[PDB]
Design a protein around this ligand. Sequence first.
Ligand SMILES: CN(C)[C@H]1CN(Cc2c(F)cccc2Br)C[C@@H]1c1cn(C)c2ccccc12
Length: 358
Amino acid sequence: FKCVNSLKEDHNQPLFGVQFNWHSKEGDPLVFATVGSNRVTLYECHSQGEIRLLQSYVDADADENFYTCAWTYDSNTSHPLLAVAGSRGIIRIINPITMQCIKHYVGHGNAINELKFHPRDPNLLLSVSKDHALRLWNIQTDTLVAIFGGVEGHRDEVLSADYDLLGEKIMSCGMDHSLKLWRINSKRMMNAIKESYDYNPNKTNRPFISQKIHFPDFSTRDIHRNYVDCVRWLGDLILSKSCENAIVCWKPGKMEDDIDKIKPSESNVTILGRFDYSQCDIWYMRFSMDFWQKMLALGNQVGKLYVWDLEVEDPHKAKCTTLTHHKCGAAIRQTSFSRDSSILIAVCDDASIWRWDR
Ligand SMILES: CN(C)[C@H]1CN(Cc2c(F)cccc2Br)C[C@@H]1c1cn(C)c2ccccc12
């Protein structure tokens, strides 16, 4: 990777999120979204490092602060869609072509820290909230499928979550120091998703009933000793970090325990490795993976990028490379790889954007 360009957004506030559109069409240039202040902005990557500015959506409320975005597509037309959310607790579904807000969702209206789309179903959107819950939405029928909470759920803000490969289960994490597993391939949840697709408020009198899921299928506070701010599945293993200068690779149970035989009472975890780094001990810093999960990237609080090659026989054998530029000194909140892994974008606390090309 070589640094080929940079720019800075005019708001001078932190850029909290960046996502390439991995649903961009064949023959179209690569496009990424950034979120910060009260806006979302799209850019196109071109030759000679060119980052071409397209168009933003700016919230009507000057005090909105977007924290997260996620791409999907319209399941009938194939056109890409962009979901954004943040401090107002409003999910907006944006048409990236025109930057129109197509529709919006409100749960209880508390800050949303992360959005993720289901890996197999483009209509299923997961939101994680400051109000300690996760919510699963069906953006085809505009239904709240399920709320994951209760006293056995998270006890402080939820900061991140991730679906597994097939979208059969979710791992969430947050300020309570815990990582929690929620299975969504239960008979109850499969039925709830089916029912959400059968719901049309114009053809019935009932409201749509959301599931209240109050018990995770596994919980641990034994991995980290502070806020857990990013989580990703790597097959049946988990990668998670806190503010302790480490990403930990771990699994529920003992070494030979199958993830789908783990019981909610399971008290053990197994640590398969740990990727240490420096100067990333402030709260709220995300890591990202490429589409194939061959690579992992994290920025630190002084503008350095760490990239790990995970194409090795065991997690602890990952190969690290570091990327620095003398003008990039602000905290990197999130990174994104293009689908082919040819471009890595980093976004920063000073509203700067950095492009690295292979
Ligand atoms: C207060 N909450 C908990 C954070 C959560 N963060 C989202 C987020 C996350 F959840 C996990 C990992 C990275 C990130 Br980025 C948005 C919020 C926030 C507001 N301001 C002004 C900030 C200033 C600096 C950093 C974060 C925030």
